[PDB]
mmCIF file of all heavy atoms in Angstrom:
data_model
loop_
_atom_site.group_PDB
_atom_site.id
_atom_site.type_symbol
_atom_site.label_atom_id
_atom_site.label_comp_id
_atom_site.label_asym_id
_atom_site.label_seq_id
_atom_site.Cartn_x
_atom_site.Cartn_y
_atom_site.Cartn_z
ATOM 1 N N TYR A 44 -210.538 326.033 39.533
ATOM 2 C CA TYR A 44 -211.096 325.012 38.717
ATOM 3 C C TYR A 44 -212.441 324.766 39.360
ATOM 4 O O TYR A 44 -212.603 324.860 40.597
ATOM 5 C CB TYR A 44 -210.200 323.766 38.813
ATOM 6 C CG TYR A 44 -210.577 322.745 37.801
ATOM 7 C CD1 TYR A 44 -210.133 322.800 36.512
ATOM 8 C CD2 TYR A 44 -211.451 321.672 38.157
ATOM 9 C CE1 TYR A 44 -210.563 321.825 35.590
ATOM 10 C CE2 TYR A 44 -211.789 320.767 37.271
ATOM 11 C CZ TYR A 44 -211.335 320.806 35.974
ATOM 12 O OH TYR A 44 -211.698 319.902 35.013
ATOM 13 N N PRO A 45 -213.467 324.371 38.521
ATOM 14 C CA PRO A 45 -214.783 324.211 39.125
ATOM 15 C C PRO A 45 -214.826 323.180 40.275
ATOM 16 O O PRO A 45 -214.132 322.201 40.315
ATOM 17 C CB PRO A 45 -215.603 323.663 37.923
ATOM 18 C CG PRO A 45 -214.894 324.286 36.682
ATOM 19 C CD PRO A 45 -213.444 324.342 37.075
ATOM 20 N N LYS A 46 -215.723 323.452 41.240
ATOM 21 C CA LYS A 46 -216.031 322.638 42.319
ATOM 22 C C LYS A 46 -214.935 322.527 43.405
ATOM 23 O O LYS A 46 -214.754 321.522 44.090
ATOM 24 C CB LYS A 46 -216.575 321.235 41.875
ATOM 25 C CG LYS A 46 -217.533 321.271 40.711
ATOM 26 C CD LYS A 46 -218.608 322.338 40.892
ATOM 27 C CE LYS A 46 -219.551 321.966 42.019
ATOM 28 N NZ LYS A 46 -220.427 323.136 42.396
ATOM 29 N N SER A 47 -214.055 323.561 43.430
ATOM 30 C CA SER A 47 -212.957 323.564 44.398
ATOM 31 C C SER A 47 -213.184 324.416 45.602
ATOM 32 O O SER A 47 -212.290 324.531 46.408
ATOM 33 C CB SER A 47 -211.729 324.129 43.632
ATOM 34 O OG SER A 47 -211.475 323.374 42.456
ATOM 35 N N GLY A 48 -214.397 324.963 45.805
ATOM 36 C CA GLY A 48 -214.688 325.805 46.920
ATOM 37 C C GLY A 48 -214.829 327.310 46.574
ATOM 38 O O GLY A 48 -214.649 328.133 47.434
ATOM 39 N N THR A 49 -215.095 327.613 45.310
ATOM 40 C CA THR A 49 -215.188 329.012 44.819
ATOM 41 C C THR A 49 -216.214 329.795 45.672
ATOM 42 O O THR A 49 -215.854 330.920 46.087
ATOM 43 C CB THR A 49 -215.820 329.038 43.417
ATOM 44 O OG1 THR A 49 -215.183 327.996 42.636
ATOM 45 C CG2 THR A 49 -215.473 330.371 42.785
ATOM 46 N N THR A 50 -217.362 329.261 45.931
ATOM 47 C CA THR A 50 -218.447 329.911 46.646
ATOM 48 C C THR A 50 -217.972 330.304 48.049
ATOM 49 O O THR A 50 -218.214 331.334 48.554
ATOM 50 C CB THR A 50 -219.732 329.134 46.630
ATOM 51 O OG1 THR A 50 -220.000 328.696 45.291
ATOM 52 C CG2 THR A 50 -220.907 329.798 47.217
ATOM 53 N N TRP A 51 -217.255 329.277 48.693
ATOM 54 C CA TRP A 51 -216.705 329.442 50.015
ATOM 55 C C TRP A 51 -215.770 330.625 50.129
ATOM 56 O O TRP A 51 -215.992 331.522 50.948
ATOM 57 C CB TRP A 51 -216.088 328.192 50.470
ATOM 58 C CG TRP A 51 -215.717 327.973 51.889
ATOM 59 C CD1 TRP A 51 -216.081 328.828 52.903
ATOM 60 C CD2 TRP A 51 -214.948 326.905 52.547
ATOM 61 N NE1 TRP A 51 -215.563 328.322 54.134
ATOM 62 C CE2 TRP A 51 -214.860 327.138 53.865
ATOM 63 C CE3 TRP A 51 -214.373 325.802 51.977
ATOM 64 C CZ2 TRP A 51 -214.169 326.353 54.767
ATOM 65 C CZ3 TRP A 51 -213.624 324.964 52.887
ATOM 66 C CH2 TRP A 51 -213.605 325.208 54.222
ATOM 67 N N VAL A 52 -214.736 330.611 49.339
ATOM 68 C CA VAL A 52 -213.693 331.707 49.462
ATOM 69 C C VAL A 52 -214.338 333.024 48.948
ATOM 70 O O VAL A 52 -213.999 334.077 49.517
ATOM 71 C CB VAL A 52 -212.419 331.298 48.654
ATOM 72 C CG1 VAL A 52 -212.640 331.245 47.190
ATOM 73 C CG2 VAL A 52 -211.340 332.256 49.040
ATOM 74 N N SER A 53 -215.261 333.036 47.968
ATOM 75 C CA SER A 53 -215.937 334.178 47.610
ATOM 76 C C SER A 53 -216.624 334.912 48.756
ATOM 77 O O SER A 53 -216.558 336.095 48.923
ATOM 78 C CB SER A 53 -216.937 333.846 46.477
ATOM 79 O OG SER A 53 -216.333 333.385 45.341
ATOM 80 N N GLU A 54 -217.321 334.134 49.547
ATOM 81 C CA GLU A 54 -218.076 334.725 50.648
ATOM 82 C C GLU A 54 -217.175 335.178 51.775
ATOM 83 O O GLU A 54 -217.451 336.226 52.390
ATOM 84 C CB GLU A 54 -219.148 333.682 51.138
ATOM 85 C CG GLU A 54 -220.142 334.377 52.177
ATOM 86 C CD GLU A 54 -221.136 335.303 51.543
ATOM 87 O OE1 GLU A 54 -221.140 335.461 50.303
ATOM 88 O OE2 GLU A 54 -221.957 335.903 52.280
ATOM 89 N N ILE A 55 -216.036 334.510 51.976
ATOM 90 C CA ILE A 55 -214.989 335.034 52.875
ATOM 91 C C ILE A 55 -214.488 336.365 52.401
ATOM 92 O O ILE A 55 -214.403 337.299 53.193
ATOM 93 C CB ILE A 55 -213.896 334.016 53.049
ATOM 94 C CG1 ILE A 55 -214.299 332.698 53.571
ATOM 95 C CG2 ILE A 55 -212.653 334.631 53.823
ATOM 96 C CD1 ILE A 55 -213.205 331.612 53.570
ATOM 97 N N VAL A 56 -214.171 336.446 51.165
ATOM 98 C CA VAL A 56 -213.626 337.677 50.548
ATOM 99 C C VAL A 56 -214.699 338.828 50.683
ATOM 100 O O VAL A 56 -214.404 339.982 50.985
ATOM 101 C CB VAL A 56 -213.267 337.494 49.081
ATOM 102 C CG1 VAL A 56 -213.087 338.846 48.463
ATOM 103 C CG2 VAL A 56 -211.989 336.698 49.064
ATOM 104 N N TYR A 57 -215.948 338.530 50.429
ATOM 105 C CA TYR A 57 -216.999 339.471 50.457
ATOM 106 C C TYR A 57 -217.144 340.035 51.725
ATOM 107 O O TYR A 57 -217.287 341.286 52.022
ATOM 108 C CB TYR A 57 -218.301 338.994 49.886
ATOM 109 C CG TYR A 57 -219.248 340.062 49.233
ATOM 110 C CD1 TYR A 57 -219.016 340.460 47.928
ATOM 111 C CD2 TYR A 57 -220.168 340.702 50.045
ATOM 112 C CE1 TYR A 57 -219.768 341.493 47.385
ATOM 113 C CE2 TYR A 57 -220.966 341.710 49.492
ATOM 114 C CZ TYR A 57 -220.732 342.080 48.162
ATOM 115 O OH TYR A 57 -221.555 343.100 47.586
ATOM 116 N N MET A 58 -217.130 339.135 52.796
ATOM 117 C CA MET A 58 -217.184 339.609 54.190
ATOM 118 C C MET A 58 -216.094 340.481 54.551
ATOM 119 O O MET A 58 -216.246 341.512 55.135
ATOM 120 C CB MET A 58 -217.203 338.300 55.123
ATOM 121 C CG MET A 58 -218.579 337.725 55.316
ATOM 122 S SD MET A 58 -219.661 338.615 56.494
ATOM 123 C CE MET A 58 -218.967 338.003 57.994
ATOM 124 N N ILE A 59 -214.828 340.151 54.101
ATOM 125 C CA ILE A 59 -213.655 341.035 54.358
ATOM 126 C C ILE A 59 -213.907 342.429 53.756
ATOM 127 O O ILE A 59 -213.662 343.405 54.412
ATOM 128 C CB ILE A 59 -212.325 340.385 53.915
ATOM 129 C CG1 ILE A 59 -212.063 339.117 54.691
ATOM 130 C CG2 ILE A 59 -211.186 341.281 54.060
ATOM 131 C CD1 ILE A 59 -210.915 338.262 54.102
ATOM 132 N N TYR A 60 -214.417 342.445 52.588
ATOM 133 C CA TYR A 60 -214.749 343.791 51.899
ATOM 134 C C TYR A 60 -215.717 344.557 52.707
ATOM 135 O O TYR A 60 -215.641 345.788 52.736
ATOM 136 C CB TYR A 60 -215.236 343.505 50.480
ATOM 137 C CG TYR A 60 -214.238 343.451 49.378
ATOM 138 C CD1 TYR A 60 -213.096 342.656 49.513
ATOM 139 C CD2 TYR A 60 -214.287 344.271 48.223
ATOM 140 C CE1 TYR A 60 -212.116 342.613 48.538
ATOM 141 C CE2 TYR A 60 -213.357 344.229 47.265
ATOM 142 C CZ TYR A 60 -212.291 343.462 47.358
ATOM 143 O OH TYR A 60 -211.324 343.399 46.405
ATOM 144 N N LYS A 61 -216.692 343.878 53.262
ATOM 145 C CA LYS A 61 -217.744 344.543 53.971
ATOM 146 C C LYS A 61 -217.463 344.697 55.469
ATOM 147 O O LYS A 61 -218.371 344.950 56.299
ATOM 148 C CB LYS A 61 -219.072 343.788 53.821
ATOM 149 C CG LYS A 61 -219.556 343.820 52.307
ATOM 150 C CD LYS A 61 -219.432 345.177 51.684
ATOM 151 C CE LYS A 61 -220.226 345.214 50.337
ATOM 152 N NZ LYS A 61 -220.136 346.577 49.709
ATOM 153 N N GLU A 62 -216.205 344.469 55.881
ATOM 154 C CA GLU A 62 -215.835 344.503 57.264
ATOM 155 C C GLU A 62 -216.760 343.623 58.153
ATOM 156 O O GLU A 62 -217.181 343.993 59.215
ATOM 157 C CB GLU A 62 -215.742 345.901 57.802
ATOM 158 C CG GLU A 62 -215.049 346.104 59.217
ATOM 159 C CD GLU A 62 -213.558 345.626 59.307
ATOM 160 O OE1 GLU A 62 -212.868 345.626 58.288
ATOM 161 O OE2 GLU A 62 -213.183 345.279 60.409
ATOM 162 N N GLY A 63 -217.137 342.493 57.622
ATOM 163 C CA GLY A 63 -217.960 341.472 58.327
ATOM 164 C C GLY A 63 -219.375 341.842 58.593
ATOM 165 O O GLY A 63 -219.985 341.296 59.510
ATOM 166 N N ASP A 64 -219.952 342.763 57.786
ATOM 167 C CA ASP A 64 -221.349 343.091 57.901
ATOM 168 C C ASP A 64 -222.153 342.080 57.159
ATOM 169 O O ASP A 64 -222.231 342.084 55.967
ATOM 170 C CB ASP A 64 -221.551 344.436 57.347
ATOM 171 C CG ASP A 64 -222.989 345.052 57.606
ATOM 172 O OD1 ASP A 64 -223.898 344.193 57.677
ATOM 173 O OD2 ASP A 64 -223.114 346.284 57.716
ATOM 174 N N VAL A 65 -222.816 341.249 57.952
ATOM 175 C CA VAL A 65 -223.526 340.072 57.424
ATOM 176 C C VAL A 65 -224.769 340.548 56.598
ATOM 177 O O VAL A 65 -225.033 339.947 55.501
ATOM 178 C CB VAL A 65 -223.947 339.103 58.593
ATOM 179 C CG1 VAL A 65 -225.098 338.209 58.053
ATOM 180 C CG2 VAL A 65 -222.735 338.304 58.982
ATOM 181 N N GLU A 66 -225.373 341.640 57.015
ATOM 182 C CA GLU A 66 -226.594 342.119 56.328
ATOM 183 C C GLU A 66 -226.191 342.556 54.914
ATOM 184 O O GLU A 66 -226.843 342.306 53.988
ATOM 185 C CB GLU A 66 -227.193 343.277 57.121
ATOM 186 N N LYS A 67 -225.045 343.276 54.793
ATOM 187 C CA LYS A 67 -224.538 343.633 53.479
ATOM 188 C C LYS A 67 -224.296 342.482 52.600
ATOM 189 O O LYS A 67 -224.480 342.486 51.336
ATOM 190 C CB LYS A 67 -223.261 344.529 53.581
ATOM 191 C CG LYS A 67 -223.536 345.965 54.158
ATOM 192 C CD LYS A 67 -222.270 346.793 54.152
ATOM 193 C CE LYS A 67 -222.516 348.114 54.788
ATOM 194 N NZ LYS A 67 -221.270 348.990 54.844
#
Side-chain angles (χ1 to χ4, degrees), residues 44-65 67:
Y44 192 82
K46 318 315 292 167
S47 303
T49 320
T50 308
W51 193 9
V52 68
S53 295
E54 191 69 7
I55 297 174
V56 166
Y57 207 84
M58 279 281 281
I59 295 170
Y60 269 51
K61 298 310 194 178
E62 189 63 27
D64 190 329
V65 162
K67 290 184 181 179

